């Protein structure tokens, strides 16, 4: 398995909004088409959210994933990874209900409580926002992603009992330290899939020294018992992916994380970012991991051992 | 002013509790005695909280500082720095009322929302906790220090209008990035007093690479328009102070931040930690800054230009 | 010039020897064909050495470049960069005679005296060595590349007078500090073309922390007044090229530096390595620099201002 | 041994010259008095050179150490460490003759060939130079310290057979990689005493990032099997000593390395610099190591197992 790079594709998320790009997937069929195309392009892991079809706003309910998960699984053996994020006012118990019911191989896990903002972008996007929910959100200077020590323990115990393992999303150094606290307690066992997230407002930035700091910290705290992946937000996406691939890590792309392709051009598909990351991986002389290889690298339970 | 090291002394805080050490100052007279002794030992800046005298629990009200601030100022020309922290349930408007009324030269400003915990220490301290509030607090796995982008802007505008400048407490890289957002908007002007805080559960750790990462980040984002200070929590206090002093930075000590002296011995006074930091500073061939020197280095309004 | 990446191709050098790979160019026509193929693949700068045609040993004489330089210039607008290296017993005056006579736009300049060794490969390669000079060289534990402060000054003054600018080869941190000494004296003017060389025995290694250390050091010492390129020796070539490209730097490839392609195979051409670098550059959404773009970025005198 | 800091004192060396400071020890009795005073102040290891008494020039002959070693041993239990440096034209066999004959517990070992220079100080110091040898040396732009792979191997095998262990002087990253080559071959066994040297012209600089780079590199290459000491040349001496002590490392001081005390004054004794380091060590709450503690930490043969 040496020299195999796992590409995760995060297809729509909850941070970007439909007025920001006509290519952001909104309907269940757009999301499944995006996931299937990304998997066919080489993404072994698909990170999934759902949205309301009427206005594109985030929908974290159990049933919102019903027309998503089985459709993708029928078409692709990719590893499906269900978010545990949600609105700042939603309880951790409600946020984990989709992963608790579907028992996926992976669920995402944000490792700390943090501010988040997109309000600096209001000058560029306000005139094109079509829905009031987007105006309310983009203008909100009081957003927190809440993931207390007690919340994270609850997710680890409750979802871990169903065989789900985590994409541990770590947005700054303290998230790696928080993860070390739970790893030393035995609440999660290795190999840990650690997704270090760069460039978001409220998180660490995307400078090369930020990337190496996160890598050095994770190496020191976890040794060989983790698998490193990077998420470079926005136009950092491919620069940070190339650093990770060149350093022995794995790569996350997707329209959840970056709407752009080049100088002012929007990305039209998730598959197009997978293809770019694959060009970098293969240019290095490495190979993209298949879903079966990713399941071995991440010690996952199998695409059949799920409730969909 | 080159080669002058500002020692800040944080005398009691709100993180440690009285059952943890009989030397933690609780009454207003204990706090003023601690501040005056620390200033006489060489601390040019005193970071202040108040407590209820009956049970030692934190007291963030305006009047709790009345028997503190004028008493210290009568005895010492040190710069008095009032906290803006408070219970996780207290609004930012209520948290800033003491600094808003007293118009101090400095107030503290936490730069992001973060988890915090002391619950891992429950096994060592539970049997000695005398007050139920300490049991409730030490056992709480859901503590957040809330400092949203909107909260921080409110503090900057409201307290800045009274001439107060900030001790910007930055507990991880993202806090430096958050501060850069407000600095670029002009909401705070340099020189920025940046207190990088190491070793707390919920914050960055205290490894030497953490220290250098925070320093490099601040240098890149702020250039020469800041003054660096370090706070090493707990038994990291003097190791991190010595790194900063040897690198051109300033130093924070105090029982708010570290209860210990050596191998299992509690520190008996704040002045004793000031004396240790002063031994390191002078051993380097440097000198401890006086309050007048600190006011020049930090561009402060003067110890007379305050409402006490 | 935003987003334009200069690819240097070093076609043969003096460190590898013919018995290590049948694809290492030896004759003048193999060296010119290699250079022209590399430039056609996208290399804007060609770093050149010559060899004796009979046994492949290094030939640093003026006339050894006569059947090389004008031939490449007639076929390609690439920038031609002449080595100033030489056998350890050759004086700096003799080493510089080729660049002194030909007055190229670029010449290489090693910034410090250092050990170098290949002897650990002797066990594997001894049986296949066809020439005694290769046995004497690979077995030599006493190799030094001599470049004293006086030597480097002589190169800077003597070749600078002919309008030649330098590829400053820096094989460790001290080489960047040596360069800073001469830059502060005004003996070289920016923009400095700094080639940081990783992975040779006797130089810095090729770990990612070594790459970021050389970048951070150069950024601190030279600011905006340099252009960074990387040389990852051996199988580090593409990993380190990808880091550089992803960080705003330029890339050096070539059979002088790395005999290998992917997965343990030898590289058949220099062009194949240029193509691999170009796949990484274009995968990042960047563009390979043309010779005219490299001349502007490096402030070079022009391909029509040379003595060939 | 937790918390015990080894102070090495290098009393005279060969880099500074008498006309730079009247306090640099020259005669055998000035060198022994300096060593005994430094050991009494707290230095557990004394790094020794000899000089010609008539003009102060370096004297690397066996017999130049005869009025030095036994005199110090009779007065102090400090570990005596004999240089293996020498004029650039002296063979490695001649350079090692003193340690070869005397079979000390420690000998110094420079791990690579490098430039060295003092010529930038010539303008300021020329008028005060009293001896022609000092003028010839300070003006020399062609100084190399020669330590090839073959040279270092010869030192390791020849002096190792007498039970001498090494102070491995590493003046840049490549020296730690050179040491790793010999350690992996088994030519030296741990624990390795690694002295990372900062700030010399021709070596790595003395910026805090240089210090952390050498520490991180040594930690990665050698793990727990080394003991780290720092040498900050010149006025960097105490800043870098403080970083090391605060990070779990050891400290080297002495007039060989730094002629200065504080605030631009020359240091009158080696003991004065030991006292300053000890003030930093004790201010940190650490303790200076005794000779017996240094022998255990460095796995030395004992002061009664030497040939003097
Ligand atoms: O999308 C997710 O899964 C995470 C939750 C916080 C922000 N994004
Ligand atoms: O004590 C203060 O001022 C800060 C507030 C959060 C934790 N400590
Ligand atoms: O090939 C060159 O130009 C350099 C000289 C020293 C080693 N390689
Ligand atoms: O003094 C010594 O032992 C080393 C040898 C090279 C420079 N200094
Ligand atoms: Zn997500
Ligand atoms: Zn406080
Ligand atoms: Zn070359
Ligand atoms: Zn020496």
Author numbering:
A (entry chain A), B (entry chain A), C (entry chain B), D (entry chain B): 3 to 310
Paste lines from the article.
Next, a β-keto acid cleavage enzyme (BKACE)28,29 converts the non-native substrate MSA with acetyl-CoA into acetoacetate and formyl-CoA. The Claisen-like condensation reaction accepts various β-keto acids that react with acetyl-CoA to form an acyl-CoA ester and acetoacetate. In these assays, BKACE15 from Paracoccus denitrificans performed best. BKACE15 forms a homotetramer where each active site is accommodated in a TIM-barrel fold, and consists of eight β-sheets that are surrounded by eight α-helices.
The two openings of the TIM barrel are closed off by smaller α-helices. As previously reported for the BKACE from Candidatus Cloacamonas acidaminovorans, a close homolog of BKACE15, each active site coordinates a single Zn2+ ion. We confirmed a 1:1 zinc binding ratio in BKACE15 using Inductively Coupled Plasma Optical Emission Spectroscopy (ICP-OES). The physiological role of this enzyme is unknown. However, the genetic context suggests that BKACE15 is involved in the degradation of aromatic compounds, while experimentally confirmed substrates include β-ketohexanoate, 3,5-dioxohexanoate, 5-hydroxy-β-ketohexanoate and β-ketopentanoate.
